[PDB]
Amino acid sequence: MRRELACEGYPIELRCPGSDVIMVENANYGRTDDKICDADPFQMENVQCYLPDAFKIMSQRCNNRTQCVVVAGSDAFPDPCPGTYKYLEVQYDCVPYVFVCPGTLQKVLEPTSTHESEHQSGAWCKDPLQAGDRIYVMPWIPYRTDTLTEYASWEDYVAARHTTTYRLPNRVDGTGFVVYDGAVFYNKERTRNIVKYDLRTRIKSGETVINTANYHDTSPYRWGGKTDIDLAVDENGLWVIYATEGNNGRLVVSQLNPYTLRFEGTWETGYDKRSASNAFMVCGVLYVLRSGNRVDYAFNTNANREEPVSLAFPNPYQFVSSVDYNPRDNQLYVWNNYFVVRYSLEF
Ligand SMILES: *[C@@H]1O[C@H](CO)[C@@H](O)[C@H](O)[C@H]1NC(C)=O
Ligand SMILES: [Ca+2]
């Protein structure tokens, strides 16, 4: 994380790479060390001067912005130690697009519907970190799934006008995969491991074996078809939805770091995967499809408590391939029985 300093009276400016925005993670206005901002050795003596309130002052002015004009003076900041020279030490990070929870899910709408695709099963998702209409379409074919196609826009996909073709080094084992910061997260065929293939660099950059998780048609969805592992991205981050022997057939949702490829916890839900249609994450809350085509189960990982909220979902066809949520547009990317569809939501 980036760090910048400015003495008492001198302004501080936090710059972000081009389109990115400031995110304050640590801040203090005072003195921690004597050697910094030389003025008077008598004034430099107090090395225990702190102002914890400096966080909110910086966060209110710098966040959701590329740059911020903040002056480390007595006018904007309160003096914590009178008769001591001060400096502002700020530890921050730049984000391409920051995301916050829009609200609570109620009824799923029906707008934006695409044509009858070439294949019955597959998955499609937009990059939540990249601003634009870049569509990553991955058609699923049994025992030979291996290529992702790129499309410039909704108009570009319906007209069969593709931008590029990506030949993955491993075969895909399931439909509902996910694209995060130009990197594809997919399950390897005949294995419990997930591969991170960065399309940006066009080279493999990580692989993590998911322990106790049932792989390759062992524990897929109601229709089957190698969907043992279904990746989803929400407002919180990256999630890996699967089923273990430890939970006994039930869904095991776990948070995974997109860059370190390490786990940030493991949760247990009370809903069968063999009865489930397709699971996706929204604001850290799980939602499991049932196909009587509606979502009945929901589990809050942040609260570690479930809620059986039987809420309406648009009934498409008897064959549902993949249902994944995109937190950027707050829409549902659904591939089911050839037909590919977007869906707006109630908040
Ligand atoms: C990329 O590499 C593959 C395999 O070596 C080759 O078939 C393909 O033509 C290359 N793409 C181009 C046109 O650069
Ligand atoms: Ca899903």
Author numbering: 35 to 325, 336 to 391
Reproduce, without paraphrasing, sentences from the article in which this PDB structure was first reported.
Teneurins are ancient metazoan cell adhesion receptors that control brain development and neuronal wiring in higher animals. The extracellular C terminus binds the adhesion GPCR Latrophilin, forming a trans-cellular complex with synaptogenic functions. Here, we present crystal structures of Teneurin-Latrophilin complexes that reveal how the lectin and olfactomedin domains of Latrophilin bind across a spiraling beta-barrel domain of Teneurin, the YD shell. The structures revealed three signature motifs of the Teneurin fold: (1) the spiraling beta-barrel tyrosine-aspartate repeat “YD shell” domain, (2) a specialized “fibronectin plug” domain that seals off the YD shell at the N-terminal side, and (3) a beta-propeller referred to as the NCL-1, HT2A, and Lin-41 (NHL) domain.
The Olf domain is thought to contribute to the binding between Teneurin and Latrophilin (Boucard et al., 2014). Most of the buried Teneurin surface is contacted by the Lec domain, which is consistent with previous reports showing that Lec is essential and sufficient for the interaction. The total buried surface in this complex is ∼2,500 Å2. In both structures, the C-terminal Tox-GHH/TCAP domain lies ∼6 nm away from the Latrophilin binding site. FLRT is known to bind Latrophilin Olf via the concave surface of its LRR domain (Jackson et al., 2015, Lu et al., 2015). Superposition of the previously solved Lphn3-FLRT2 complex structure (Jackson et al., 2016) produces a model of how the three proteins likely interact in a ternary complex. Our structural results suggest that a ternary complex of Teneurin-Latrophilin-FLRT could form via the described 1:1 binding surfaces of Lec-Ten2 and Olf-FLRT. Superposition with the FLRT2 LRR, as found previously bound to Lphn3, gives a compact ternary model that still involves the Teneurin YD shell domain rather than other Teneurin domains. The crystallographic data explain these binding results; the NHL domain does not engage with Latrophilin directly.
